[PDB]
């Protein structure tokens, strides 16, 4: 099916505590494979997936220098942005950068995207045409003017349409065993008495990959999304994910309710009934 | 790989 590779950059300034802290991670559709921390002892790009280990020392050495430069690049960006918003040097601010490229079942290019944020709000983003920038506020025009004059959009588009998909396809082939396989959700249902007049019914989805999944309760075919406790999908730590959904039931109306699980690893949407 | 373009903002 479809696949993607995304990188997440985080630069947090430490006024007085020292120099800005920089962290970088990269993923393959849900699976992290690289790591970098400016405060770590190694000061190197480290492996986080088994299939990236085979890359030679040349790959690690240059990728370390690539990401190290970005930390320096962000360091001056903290000072530059602090000027745009007329902020004081003692405040701690953060710069977050999100970029990646999307491929298809045939491996051909689908979409590229690059987004930058300042203090949890959108700052500037590359539009889907890979030729123009979207500025969020007044200070974002200033970066937009500088980036337009520097032909930054042309430089970024070359990576997304080019080297990004070239290495994305290389990673998938190297990790066919783990990245291209889907684990269907292992489902089960549980019963909790909340009182003598009512009870709690929870529908579980365990050990599935990828993260996209849909859990819904139905009362005789009628969705109960209003009286439903939904929890955010969570990682199990072994590369799989979890999700459970609860509903409050009358003490004798358990079998009237059904749970519907939708996941790409399952050929057909599973229906679970008491 | 890595493709963040750094142009100083």
């Amino acid at each position, epitope marked *: 099916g479809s696949h993607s590779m995304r990188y997440f950059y985080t630069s947090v300034s430490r006024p007085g505590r020292g120099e800005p802290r920089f962290i970088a991670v990269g993923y393959v559709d849900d699976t992290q494979f690289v790591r970098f921390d400016s405060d770590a002892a190694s000061q190197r790009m480290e492996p986080r997936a088994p299939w990236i280990e085979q890359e030679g020392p040349e790959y690690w050495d240059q990728e370390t220098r690539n990401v190290k430069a970005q930390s320096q690049t962000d360091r*001056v960006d903290l000072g530059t942005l602090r000027g745009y918003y007329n902020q004081s040097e003692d405040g701690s601010h953060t710069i977050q950068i999100m970029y990646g490229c999307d491929v298809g079942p045939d491996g051909r290019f689908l979409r590229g995207y690059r987004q930058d944020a300042y203090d949890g709000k959108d700052y500037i983003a590359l539009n889907e045409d890979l030729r123009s920038w979207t500025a969020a506020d007044m200070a974002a025009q200033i970066t937009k003017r500088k980036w337009e004059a520097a032909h930054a959009a042309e*430089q970024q588009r070359a990576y997304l349409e080019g080297r990004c998909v070239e290495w994305l396809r290389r990673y998938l082939e190297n990790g066919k065993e783990t990245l291209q396989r889907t684990d269907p959700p292992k489902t089960h249902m549980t019963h909790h008495p909340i009182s003598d007049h009512e009870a709690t019914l929870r529908c579980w989805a365990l050990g599935f990959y990828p993260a996209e999944i849909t859990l819904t309760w139905q009362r005789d075919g009628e969705d109960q999304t209003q009286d439903t406790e939904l929890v955010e999908t969570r990682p199990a730590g072994d590369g799989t994910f979890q999700k459970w959904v609860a509903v409050v039931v009358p003490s004798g109306q358990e079998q009237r309710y059904t749970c519907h699980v939708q996941h790409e690893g399952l050929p057909k949407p599973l229906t679970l009934r008491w | 790989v890595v493709g963040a373009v750094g142009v*100083g903002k």
Partner: T-cell receptor, first 103, second 114 residues
Framework: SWALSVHEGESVTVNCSYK?????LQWYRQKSGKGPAQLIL?????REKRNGRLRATLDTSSQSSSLSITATRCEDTAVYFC??????????FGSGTQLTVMP | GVIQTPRHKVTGKGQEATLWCEPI?????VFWYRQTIVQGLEFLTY????????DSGMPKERFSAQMPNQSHSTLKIQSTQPQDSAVYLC?????????????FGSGTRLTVLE
């Protein structure tokens, strides 16, 4: 694969190859005595690009590029390098070819 | 353009050679290259906003590169040896990217004699 000789006025084509997956390729010439100077920049998402008398082509699949100079002059006698930048930080220069424009 | 001094320098083995480069004002990157053969160059070090980025080409010993301020850069060979003879080139690009136009200096021709 080291030197080229072409008479005045005729068109010159120079070839070079790179190994890394690149996002931009540039052509530089260094006149004997002075520092290198940039000629033209072509991006990986482009196939051909031209500036004045300089016409350059890029083949991503074959990892090679060609530079065409129309109506060559004696001033065009120099050594031509092609620089391949795989990212925004890496840049690798080629072996270079000596062009000699005969009068 | 880019200014390099000295244009030439002939010195005996064992001395200290200091190279000086003034990049074009406003540029946020400085590159150092040496060239032994008329063919391909050799990369030495690379700065951005006075902060080093890559020095994988610098010789491990006796070689030291500094950028005291935005407007000047120096390269120092502490113990000159005849194996260090080459043409040393200084280049500057704006916004610090290598995907941009590199403006080179005239270069320093250094010959160290035993």
């Amino acid at each position: 694969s080291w030197a080229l000789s072409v008479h005045e006025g005729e068109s010159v084509t120079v070839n070079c190859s790179y190994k890394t997956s690149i996002t931009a390729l540039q052509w530089y010439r260094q006149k004997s005595g002075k520092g290198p100077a940039q000629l033209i920049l072509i991006r990986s998402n482009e196939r051909e690009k031209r500036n004045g008398r300089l016409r350059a082509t890029l083949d991503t699949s074959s990892q090679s590029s060609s530079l065409s100079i129309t109506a060559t002059r004696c001033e065009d006698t120099a050594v031509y390098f092609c620089a391949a930048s795989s990212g925004s930080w890496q840049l690798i220069f080629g072996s270079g070819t000596q062009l000699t424009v005969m009068p | 353009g880019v200014i390099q001094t000295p244009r030439h320098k002939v010195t005996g083995k064992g001395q200290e050679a200091t190279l000086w480069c003034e990049p074009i004002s406003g540029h946020s990157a400085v590159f150092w290259y040496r060239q032994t053969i008329v063919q391909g160059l050799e990369f030495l070090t690379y700065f951005r906003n006075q902060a080093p980025i890559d020095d994988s080409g610098m010789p491990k010993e006796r070689f030291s590169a500094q950028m005291p301020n935005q407007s000047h850069s120096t390269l120092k060979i502490q113990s000159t040896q005849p194996q260090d003879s080459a043409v040393y080139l200084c280049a500057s690009s704006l916004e610090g990217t290598v995907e941009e136009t590199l403006y080179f200096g005239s270069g320093t021709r250094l010959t160290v004699l035993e």
